[PDB]
Design an enzyme around this catalytic site. Structure first.
Site, PDB file in Angstrom:
ATOM      1  N   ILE B   9      -6.910   4.861  15.083  1.00  0.00           N
ATOM      2  CA  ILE B   9      -7.209   4.982  13.661  1.00  0.00           C
ATOM      3  C   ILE B   9      -6.379   3.986  12.855  1.00  0.00           C
ATOM      4  CG2 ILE B   9      -7.467   6.573  11.744  1.00  0.00           C
ATOM      5  CD1 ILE B   9      -7.014   8.846  13.860  1.00  0.00           C
ATOM      6  N   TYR B  10       3.265   2.557   7.862  1.00  0.00           N
ATOM      7  CA  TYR B  10       4.104   1.701   8.690  1.00  0.00           C
ATOM      8  C   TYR B  10       3.239   1.043   9.748  1.00  0.00           C
ATOM      9  CZ  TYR B  10       6.955   5.497   6.838  1.00  0.00           C
ATOM     10  OH  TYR B  10       7.517   6.455   6.023  1.00  0.00           O
ATOM     11  N   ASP B 117       3.460   9.206  -4.155  1.00  0.00           N
ATOM     12  CA  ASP B 117       2.429   8.352  -3.580  1.00  0.00           C
ATOM     13  C   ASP B 117       1.160   9.178  -3.411  1.00  0.00           C
ATOM     14  OD1 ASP B 117       2.072   6.364  -0.511  1.00  0.00           O
ATOM     15  OD2 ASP B 117       1.229   6.071  -2.519  1.00  0.00           O
TER      16      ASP B 117
END
Lengths: 147, 278
Positions: B9, B10, B117
């Site tokens: 599918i 840092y 975020d």
């Protein structure tokens, strides 16, 4: 004020690593002052990290991490810097920081190992000292009287 | 190693089977040569954030000079969900998603954590219909009297106006604004509510719809590092125009979430105790 708490940190670091009666509270502070200094290779941080609260946060890790049988200052500076690295990572005003000034150890593999060891043993306290003002005071106090 | 990599599918994310216990997880794999420090923070925070609405972190491995965060696995992110179905979600799903988000978010705030975020891509959803907060890479703990945090938080389209105005210090209200946006997205064609091309543009779309802030409603705004006096655009507050698949009560909540003045933003607790929820 910063400085003052720093000496206490050094003070403490000597009372912990007794096995090195060649150490002065000034060294550990010089090490902490250094990276936070060069880190000002700007674009890295517009403001200095080492602050009262942060030293305290840092004393918190060292407290339960720095072995008492540390053999050689080099080993101290490494683990101390690992702690500092985490303090920056977790309390850092920037969203991140470099690893250059923190890795003084040779075996990179070990630096990251401590990072995991410490995180696994201090993760709760790292969050508590932030969420629990009374806990912040106890650490702050303990540090203050480590002099 | 006790894992079996599958479709990727840092670093990069992978799906996998424990091979030993057969459970399917998700691996993050972070290169260890600022990214690391961000990763170590996520790990630290996650270890203390366990809630059905917050992605779980099963383990963390240090191999081959890489850190692999073994995460639980979710069928897909909300962004892809929006593509799965299209242009519309049963008003009921809208409620469920907001509820769980607001709950998983209310939890972080209670445990003293700002996510910073919040966007559709960081919200995970299982076919079982449950939603979980993910990617705490930008998160951080708060409580200690800090001088300031950082203004480089939250993707552009979900960034609250105060931060756009360069504010370096903020509270939990910062994730609340993003939540409001996500809600707007939730209750419409699933398209972002404020997709600017840059900061200046972001500000315009916001004020163009909510009405530009007046020093009376938001006194401290002019003292902000990057504040700019924008034209006093009308208040097209008849949000109905921008969010139809939402009742009048629902719209009321969306309005309390999208307050420009951080201080005027409802909290997660309040949001959850809002009439819209019954």
């Amino acid at each position: 004020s910063t400085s003052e708490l720093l000496r206490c940190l050094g003070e403490f670091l000597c009372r912990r690593c007794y096995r090195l009666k060649h150490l002065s509270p000034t060294d550990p502070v010089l090490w902490l002052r250094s990276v936070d200094r060069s880190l000002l290779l700007q674009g890295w941080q517009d403001q200095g990290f080492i602050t009262p609260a942060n030293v305290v946060f840092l004393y918190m890790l060292c407290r339960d991490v720095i072995s008492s049988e540390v053999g050689s200052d080099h080993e101290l500076q490494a683990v101390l810097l690992t702690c500092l690295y985490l303090s920056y990572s977790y309390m850092g005003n920037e969203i991140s920081y470099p690893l250059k000034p923190f890795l003084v150890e040779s075996c990179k593999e070990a630096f990251w190992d401590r990072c995991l060891s410490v995180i696994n043993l201090m993760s709760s306290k790292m969050l508590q000292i932030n969420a629990d003002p009374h806990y912040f005071t106890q650490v702050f106090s303990d540090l203050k009287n480590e002099s | 190693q006790k894992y079996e990599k599958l479709e990727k599918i840092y670093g990069t994310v992978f799906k996998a089977k424990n091979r030993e216990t057969h459970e399917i997880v998700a691996l993050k794999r972070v290169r260890l040569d600022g990214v690391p420090s961000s990763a170590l923070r996520e790990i630290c925070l996650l270890k203390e954030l366990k809630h059905k609405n917050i992605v779980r972190l099963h383990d963390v491995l240090h191999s081959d000079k890489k850190l692999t965060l073994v995460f639980e696995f979710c069928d897909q992110d909300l962004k892809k969900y929006f593509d799965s179905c299209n242009g519309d979600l049963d008003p009921e799903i809208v409620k469920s998603f907001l509820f769980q988000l607001l709950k998983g978010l209310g939890f972080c705030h209670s445990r003293n954590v700002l996510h910073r975020d919040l966007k559709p891509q960081n919200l995970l959803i299982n076919r079982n219909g449950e939603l979980k907060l993910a990617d705490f890479g930008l998160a951080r703990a708060f409580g200690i009297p800090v001088r300031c945090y950082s203004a480089e938080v939250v993707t552009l389209w979900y960034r609250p106006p105060d931060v756009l105005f360069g504010a370096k210090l903020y509270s939990t209200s910062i994730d609340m604004w993003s939540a409001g946006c996500i809600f707007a997205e939730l209750a419409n064609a699933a398209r972002p509510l404020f997709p600017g091309n840059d900061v200046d543009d972001q500000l315009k779309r916001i004020f163009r719809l909510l009405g530009t802030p007046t020093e009376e409603q938001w006194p401290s705004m002019t003292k902000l590092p990057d504040y700019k006096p924008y034209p006093m655009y009308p208040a097209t507050t008849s949000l109905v125009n921008v969010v139809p698949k939402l009742n009048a009560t629902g719209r009321d909540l969306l309005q309390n979430l999208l307050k420009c003045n951080p201080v005027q933003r409802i909290s997660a607790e309040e949001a959850l105790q809002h009439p819209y929820f019954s």
